[PDB]
Amino acid sequence: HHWGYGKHNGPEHWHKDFPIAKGERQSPVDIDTHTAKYDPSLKPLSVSYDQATSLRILNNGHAFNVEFDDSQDKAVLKGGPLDGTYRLIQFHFHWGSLDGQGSEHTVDKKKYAAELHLVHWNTKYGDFGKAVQQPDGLAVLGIFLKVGSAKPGLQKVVDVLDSIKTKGKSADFTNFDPRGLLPESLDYWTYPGSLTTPPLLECVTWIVLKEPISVSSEQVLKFRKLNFNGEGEPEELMVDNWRPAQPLKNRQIKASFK
Ligand SMILES: CCc1cc2c(cc1OS(N)(=O)=O)CC[C@@H]1[C@@H]2CC[C@]2(C)[C@@H](O)CC[C@@H]12
Numbered sequence: 001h002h003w004g005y006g007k008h009n010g011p012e013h014w015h016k017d018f019p020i021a022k023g024e025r026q027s028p029v030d031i032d033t034h035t036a037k038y039d040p041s042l043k044p045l046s047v048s049y050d051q052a053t054s055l056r057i058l059n060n061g062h063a064f065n066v067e068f069d070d071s072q073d074k075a076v077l078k079g080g081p082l083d084g085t086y087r088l089i090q091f092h093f094h095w096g097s098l099d100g101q102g103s104e105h106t107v108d109k110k111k112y113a114a115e116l117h118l119v120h121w122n123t124k125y126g127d128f129g130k131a132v133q134q135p136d137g138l139a140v141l142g143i144f145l146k147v148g149s150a151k152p153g154l155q156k157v158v159d160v161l162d163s164i165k166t167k168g169k170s171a172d173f174t175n176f177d178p179r180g181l182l183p184e185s186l187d188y189w190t191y192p193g194s195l196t197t198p199p200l201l202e203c204v205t206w207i208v209l210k211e212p213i214s215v216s217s218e219q220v221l222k223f224r225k226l227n228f229n230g231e232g233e234p235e236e237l238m239v240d241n242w243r244p245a246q247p248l249k250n251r252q253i254k255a256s257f258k
Protein backbone atom coordinates (compact mmCIF):
# COMPACT_ATOMS: atom_id res chain seq x y z
CA HIS A 1 0.00 0.00 0.00
CA HIS A 2 2.44 2.63 -1.15
CA TRP A 3 1.67 6.20 -2.07
CA GLY A 4 -0.04 7.27 -5.27
CA TYR A 5 -2.80 9.53 -6.51
CA GLY A 6 -5.89 7.50 -5.68
CA LYS A 7 -8.65 7.83 -3.10
CA HIS A 8 -6.86 5.65 -0.57
CA ASN A 9 -3.25 6.57 -1.15
CA GLY A 10 -3.32 10.08 -2.64
CA PRO A 11 -2.14 13.50 -1.48
CA GLU A 12 -4.39 13.64 1.62
CA HIS A 13 -2.72 10.45 2.89
CA TRP A 14 0.93 11.21 2.26
CA HIS A 15 1.56 12.94 5.58
CA LYS A 16 1.27 9.61 7.44
CA ASP A 17 4.41 8.16 5.84
CA PHE A 18 5.98 11.59 5.20
CA PRO A 19 5.13 14.10 7.94
CA ILE A 20 7.02 16.87 6.10
CA ALA A 21 3.88 16.94 3.93
CA LYS A 22 2.62 19.46 6.52
CA GLY A 23 5.94 21.34 6.64
CA GLU A 24 6.89 24.95 6.25
CA ARG A 25 8.00 24.99 2.59
CA GLN A 26 5.79 22.54 0.69
CA SER A 27 5.03 22.59 -3.01
CA PRO A 28 3.15 23.23 -5.17
CA VAL A 29 1.49 26.54 -4.27
CA ASP A 30 -0.98 28.94 -5.79
CA ILE A 31 0.85 31.85 -7.34
CA ASP A 32 -1.16 34.95 -6.47
CA THR A 33 0.15 37.21 -9.18
CA HIS A 34 -1.08 40.36 -7.52
CA THR A 35 0.75 39.54 -4.24
CA ALA A 36 4.03 38.27 -5.78
CA LYS A 37 6.63 40.99 -5.56
CA TYR A 38 8.90 42.20 -8.28
CA ASP A 39 12.52 41.71 -7.17
CA PRO A 40 14.91 43.82 -9.24
CA SER A 41 18.24 42.28 -8.27
CA LEU A 42 16.80 38.96 -9.51
CA LYS A 43 19.10 38.12 -12.39
CA PRO A 44 18.01 36.94 -15.81
CA LEU A 45 17.66 33.19 -15.95
CA SER A 46 20.49 31.45 -17.81
CA VAL A 47 19.35 28.26 -19.46
CA SER A 48 22.19 26.55 -21.29
CA TYR A 49 20.89 23.42 -22.98
CA ASP A 50 22.97 23.37 -26.23
CA GLN A 51 25.06 20.36 -25.11
CA ALA A 52 22.23 18.40 -23.37
CA THR A 53 22.56 14.65 -23.83
CA SER A 54 19.31 12.74 -23.30
CA LEU A 55 19.67 9.03 -22.59
CA ARG A 56 16.44 7.27 -21.80
CA ILE A 57 12.74 7.65 -21.08
CA LEU A 58 11.25 5.75 -18.14
CA ASN A 59 7.72 5.16 -16.86
CA ASN A 60 8.26 5.14 -13.07
CA GLY A 61 4.68 4.47 -12.07
CA HIS A 62 3.69 8.09 -11.38
CA ALA A 63 5.06 9.98 -14.35
CA PHE A 64 7.52 9.47 -17.20
CA ASN A 65 11.06 10.85 -16.91
CA VAL A 66 13.32 11.82 -19.78
CA GLU A 67 16.79 11.34 -18.23
CA PHE A 68 20.00 13.09 -19.19
CA ASP A 69 23.72 12.41 -18.79
CA ASP A 70 24.57 14.60 -15.83
CA SER A 71 28.14 13.40 -15.31
CA GLN A 72 29.53 16.64 -16.81
CA ASP A 73 28.33 20.24 -17.05
CA LYS A 74 26.44 19.82 -20.32
CA ALA A 75 23.03 21.34 -19.68
CA VAL A 76 22.91 23.84 -16.86
CA LEU A 77 20.68 26.37 -15.22
CA LYS A 78 22.22 29.40 -13.56
CA GLY A 79 21.32 32.94 -12.63
CA GLY A 80 17.89 34.02 -11.53
CA PRO A 81 17.62 33.48 -7.76
CA LEU A 82 20.35 30.85 -7.92
CA ASP A 83 23.88 30.91 -6.60
CA GLY A 84 26.16 28.60 -8.52
CA THR A 85 25.44 26.04 -11.22
CA TYR A 86 22.69 23.51 -11.42
CA ARG A 87 22.87 20.53 -13.81
CA LEU A 88 19.93 19.12 -15.68
CA ILE A 89 19.20 15.51 -14.76
CA GLN A 90 15.67 14.82 -16.02
CA PHE A 91 12.36 16.26 -16.97
CA HIS A 92 8.84 14.97 -16.47
CA PHE A 93 5.23 16.18 -16.52
CA HIS A 94 2.09 16.18 -14.42
CA TRP A 95 -1.26 16.22 -16.17
CA GLY A 96 -4.97 15.82 -15.82
CA SER A 97 -7.84 13.62 -16.93
CA LEU A 98 -9.42 16.73 -18.52
CA ASP A 99 -7.87 19.84 -20.10
CA GLY A 100 -9.18 21.92 -17.15
CA GLN A 101 -6.78 20.42 -14.59
CA GLY A 102 -3.39 18.81 -14.37
CA SER A 103 -0.92 21.44 -13.26
CA GLU A 104 0.53 21.41 -9.76
CA HIS A 105 1.15 25.13 -9.43
CA THR A 106 -1.81 27.35 -10.11
CA VAL A 107 -1.87 31.00 -11.14
CA ASP A 108 -4.57 33.06 -9.40
CA LYS A 109 -6.23 29.67 -8.79
CA LYS A 110 -6.14 28.81 -12.50
CA LYS A 111 -5.17 25.23 -13.31
CA TYR A 112 -3.40 24.41 -16.56
CA ALA A 113 -3.75 21.15 -18.50
CA ALA A 114 -0.25 19.99 -17.50
CA GLU A 115 3.05 21.15 -16.01
CA LEU A 116 6.59 20.36 -17.13
CA HIS A 117 9.30 20.03 -14.53
CA LEU A 118 12.97 20.39 -15.66
CA VAL A 119 14.99 19.12 -12.72
CA HIS A 120 18.49 20.38 -11.95
CA TRP A 121 20.88 19.77 -9.04
CA ASN A 122 23.41 22.08 -7.42
CA THR A 123 26.85 20.92 -8.54
CA LYS A 124 28.45 21.95 -5.26
CA TYR A 125 26.86 18.83 -3.73
CA GLY A 126 28.55 16.43 -6.14
CA ASP A 127 25.54 14.40 -7.13
CA PHE A 128 21.80 14.33 -7.11
CA GLY A 129 21.32 12.07 -4.08
CA LYS A 130 23.41 14.37 -1.86
CA ALA A 131 21.73 17.45 -3.35
CA VAL A 132 18.21 16.38 -2.32
CA GLN A 133 19.42 16.41 1.31
CA GLN A 134 20.17 20.14 1.10
CA PRO A 135 17.85 23.12 1.36
CA ASP A 136 19.34 24.58 -1.84
CA GLY A 137 20.00 21.25 -3.52
CA LEU A 138 17.65 21.42 -6.50
CA ALA A 139 16.27 23.95 -8.94
CA VAL A 140 13.16 22.93 -10.78
CA LEU A 141 12.06 24.95 -13.80
CA GLY A 142 8.25 24.65 -14.06
CA ILE A 143 6.47 25.37 -17.33
CA PHE A 144 2.70 25.32 -17.76
CA LEU A 145 1.00 23.59 -20.70
CA LYS A 146 -2.26 24.78 -22.19
CA VAL A 147 -4.19 23.03 -24.94
CA GLY A 148 -4.21 24.79 -28.32
CA SER A 149 -1.64 24.55 -31.13
CA ALA A 150 0.80 21.64 -31.06
CA LYS A 151 4.28 21.97 -29.66
CA PRO A 152 6.43 20.44 -32.39
CA GLY A 153 9.37 19.94 -30.00
CA LEU A 154 7.21 17.70 -27.79
CA GLN A 155 6.23 15.29 -30.52
CA LYS A 156 9.28 13.04 -30.22
CA VAL A 157 8.31 12.48 -26.58
CA VAL A 158 4.68 11.78 -27.44
CA ASP A 159 5.59 9.21 -30.08
CA VAL A 160 7.75 7.05 -27.82
CA LEU A 161 5.05 6.76 -25.09
CA ASP A 162 3.58 3.63 -26.70
CA SER A 163 6.88 1.93 -25.85
CA ILE A 164 6.70 2.76 -22.12
CA LYS A 165 3.03 2.23 -21.40
CA THR A 166 3.42 0.60 -18.02
CA LYS A 167 5.39 1.06 -14.79
CA GLY A 168 9.04 0.06 -15.05
CA LYS A 169 9.29 0.19 -18.84
CA SER A 170 12.11 2.21 -20.34
CA ALA A 171 13.31 3.01 -23.83
CA ASP A 172 16.38 4.55 -25.43
CA PHE A 173 15.83 8.25 -25.95
CA THR A 174 18.93 9.93 -27.30
CA ASN A 175 19.45 13.29 -28.99
CA PHE A 176 16.31 14.91 -27.62
CA ASP A 177 16.66 18.70 -27.38
CA PRO A 178 14.80 20.18 -24.39
CA ARG A 179 15.12 23.70 -25.88
CA GLY A 180 12.10 22.72 -28.00
CA LEU A 181 9.92 22.71 -24.86
CA LEU A 182 10.60 26.30 -23.75
CA PRO A 183 8.30 29.29 -24.28
CA GLU A 184 9.59 32.56 -25.80
CA SER A 185 9.83 34.41 -22.50
CA LEU A 186 11.89 33.43 -19.45
CA ASP A 187 9.95 35.78 -17.13
CA TYR A 188 9.34 33.81 -13.93
CA TRP A 189 8.15 33.54 -10.36
CA THR A 190 10.38 31.95 -7.70
CA TYR A 191 9.96 30.65 -4.16
CA PRO A 192 11.51 28.02 -1.85
CA GLY A 193 9.70 24.73 -1.74
CA SER A 194 9.77 20.99 -2.02
CA LEU A 195 9.46 17.87 -4.13
CA THR A 196 5.78 17.53 -5.04
CA THR A 197 5.71 13.78 -4.51
CA PRO A 198 6.83 11.68 -1.56
CA PRO A 199 9.29 11.94 0.11
CA LEU A 200 8.38 15.67 -0.25
CA LEU A 201 11.88 16.82 0.66
CA GLU A 202 12.28 20.56 1.19
CA CYS A 203 15.24 20.93 -1.17
CA VAL A 204 13.85 22.85 -4.17
CA THR A 205 14.19 26.40 -5.43
CA TRP A 206 11.15 26.64 -7.72
CA ILE A 207 11.35 28.78 -10.83
CA VAL A 208 7.97 28.86 -12.60
CA LEU A 209 7.71 30.49 -16.00
CA LYS A 210 4.90 32.97 -16.58
CA GLU A 211 4.38 32.04 -20.23
CA PRO A 212 2.80 28.64 -20.86
CA ILE A 213 3.57 26.51 -23.89
CA SER A 214 0.70 25.32 -26.05
CA VAL A 215 0.32 21.63 -26.84
CA SER A 216 -2.40 20.05 -28.96
CA SER A 217 -5.35 18.05 -27.65
CA GLU A 218 -3.87 14.99 -29.43
CA GLN A 219 -0.54 15.46 -27.64
CA VAL A 220 -2.02 15.56 -24.15
CA LEU A 221 -4.44 12.73 -25.04
CA LYS A 222 -1.40 10.54 -25.59
CA PHE A 223 -0.12 11.31 -22.07
CA ARG A 224 -3.46 10.05 -20.77
CA LYS A 225 -2.98 6.62 -22.41
CA LEU A 226 -0.08 5.79 -20.14
CA ASN A 227 -0.62 3.47 -17.16
CA PHE A 228 0.25 3.80 -13.47
CA ASN A 229 0.29 0.00 -13.21
CA GLY A 230 2.85 -2.52 -14.37
CA GLU A 231 2.27 -4.83 -17.32
CA GLY A 232 -0.08 -7.67 -16.45
CA GLU A 233 -1.70 -5.73 -13.61
CA PRO A 234 -5.17 -4.15 -13.80
CA GLU A 235 -5.08 -1.05 -16.02
CA GLU A 236 -5.30 2.31 -14.34
CA LEU A 237 -4.73 5.28 -16.60
CA MET A 238 -1.95 7.61 -15.61
CA VAL A 239 -3.98 10.80 -15.26
CA ASP A 240 -4.32 13.34 -12.45
CA ASN A 241 -0.81 12.74 -11.18
CA TRP A 242 -0.70 16.22 -9.58
CA ARG A 243 -0.55 17.36 -5.96
CA PRO A 244 -2.91 20.28 -5.16
CA ALA A 245 -1.65 23.65 -3.99
CA GLN A 246 -0.34 23.71 -0.43
CA PRO A 247 -0.39 26.58 2.09
CA LEU A 248 2.19 29.31 1.37
CA LYS A 249 2.81 29.82 5.08
CA ASN A 250 5.77 32.07 5.76
CA ARG A 251 6.94 32.50 2.18
CA GLN A 252 6.94 35.29 -0.35
CA ILE A 253 6.81 34.59 -4.08
CA LYS A 254 9.14 36.85 -6.04
CA ALA A 255 8.67 37.92 -9.67
CA SER A 256 11.44 38.62 -12.16
CA PHE A 257 9.19 41.05 -14.05
CA LYS A 258 6.79 43.94 -13.55
C1 LIG B 1 12.79 16.86 -8.43
C2 LIG B 1 12.41 15.63 -9.23
C3 LIG B 1 11.82 14.63 -8.29
C4 LIG B 1 12.68 13.71 -7.66
C5 LIG B 1 12.24 12.73 -6.75
C6 LIG B 1 10.87 12.60 -6.67
C7 LIG B 1 10.05 13.51 -7.40
C8 LIG B 1 10.47 14.45 -8.39
O1 LIG B 1 9.35 15.18 -8.69
S1 LIG B 1 9.09 16.70 -8.58
N1 LIG B 1 7.63 16.81 -9.04
O2 LIG B 1 10.01 17.42 -9.47
O3 LIG B 1 9.21 16.96 -7.18
C9 LIG B 1 10.27 11.55 -5.74
C10 LIG B 1 11.17 10.33 -5.60
C11 LIG B 1 12.50 10.81 -5.05
C12 LIG B 1 13.14 11.84 -6.06
C13 LIG B 1 14.47 12.37 -5.50
C14 LIG B 1 15.50 11.24 -5.16
C15 LIG B 1 14.82 10.34 -4.12
C16 LIG B 1 14.60 11.19 -2.86
C17 LIG B 1 15.55 9.06 -3.75
O4 LIG B 1 16.74 9.32 -2.95
C18 LIG B 1 14.53 8.53 -2.76
C19 LIG B 1 13.14 8.85 -3.44
C20 LIG B 1 13.54 9.72 -4.65
Ligand SMILES: [Zn+2]
Nearest residue numbers: 092094117196
Ligand atom coordinates in the same frame (compact mmCIF):
# COMPACT_ATOMS: atom_id res chain seq x y z
ZN1 LIG C 1 7.21 17.11 -10.95
